[PDB]
Amino acid sequence: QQTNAGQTYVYYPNPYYALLALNYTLSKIDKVSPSPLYITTTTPSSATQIYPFLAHDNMFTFTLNISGTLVTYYAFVNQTFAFTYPVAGDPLIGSAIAPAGS
Amino acid sequence: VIGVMILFGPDLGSHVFQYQTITIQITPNIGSPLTISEYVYQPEGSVSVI
Amino acid sequence: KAKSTINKGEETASTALTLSGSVLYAVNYPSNTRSYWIYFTVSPSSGVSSV
Numbered sequence: 001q002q003t004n005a006g007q008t009y010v011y012y013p014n015p016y017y018a019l020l021a022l023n024y025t026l027s028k029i030d031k032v033s034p035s036p037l038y039i040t041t042t043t044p045s046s047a048t049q050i051y052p053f054l055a056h057d058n059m060f061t062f063t064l065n066i067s068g069t070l071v072t073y074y075a076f077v078n079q080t081f082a083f084t085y086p087v088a089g090d091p092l093i094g095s096a097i098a099p100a101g102s
Numbered sequence: 103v104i105g106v107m108i109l110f111g112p113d114l115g116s117h118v119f120q121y122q123t124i125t126i127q128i129t130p131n132i133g134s135p136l137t138i139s140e141y142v143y144q145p146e147g148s149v150s151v152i
Numbered sequence: 153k154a155k156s157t158i159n160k161g162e163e164t165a166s167t168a169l170t171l172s173g174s175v176l177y178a179v180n181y182p183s184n185t186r187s188y189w190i191y192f193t194v195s196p197s198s199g200v201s202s203v
Contacts, residue, residue: 004120004184005118005120005184005185006117006118006185007120007121089121091121092121099121100121100141100143101121101143103172103173103193103194103195104193104194104195105191105192105193106191106192106193106194107189107190107191108189108190108191109188109189110187110188110189110190114187115186115187115188116185116186117187118179118184118185118186118187119177119187120184126190128169128194130167130169130203132160132163132164132167133163133164133167133168133169133203134164134167134168134169135169136168136169136170136171136194138171138175138192140175142177144184145177145179145181145184146181147181148178148179148180148181149176149177149178150176150177150178150179151174151175151176151177152174152175152177
């Protein structure tokens with residue numbers, strides 16, 4: 001988030017950073033009972049064992065190096081959907097509108 | 103040709119119209135009014151032509 | 153009354169302004185924090201009637 005002329009521009013610096021954000025919103029922000037994606041660091045072997053419904057969902061992985069440790073993730077998707085996130089210069093955050101020059 | 107100048111006060115002069123839409127309207131007693139609506143990206147030069 | 157109405161009606165369809173000259177917007181340029189003023193010129197639409 002950057003600030004100038006009283007307005008605060010935000011953006012997500014990476015598609016993976018936007019994925020983890022979408023996970024938290026779908027979980028806590030808006031209470032939707034079927035969540036379309038679930039991201040967990042648990043090995044998919046045991047994660048499938050505890051959650052039997054993840055055995056039918058498409059999965060792709062992506063890793064991150066936090067504090068020197070290679071933390072890997074497993075994104076499970078059950079439905080082909082698309083989402084949008086601000087990537088450059090969007091001062092009007094909270095309205096779902098793409099301003100001119102964004 | 104007639105000149106028009108809008109001076110800002112303390113109430114509004116504390117805001118900068120960046121990435122916003124401005125609209126001004128001049129409506130005389132008899133005759134059609136003139137509306138001017140522009141979009142400002144970023145002020146530059148200390149006299150921005152927009 | 154009707155004659156005076158047509159006279160006003162003709163002045164309505166004939167009187168109008170126009171913007172001839174770009175608009176200027178002033179601000180503290182090094183640090184965009186406070187706006188100062190705005191200036192622009194206006195003229196009758198055509199050489200049709202005063203306003």
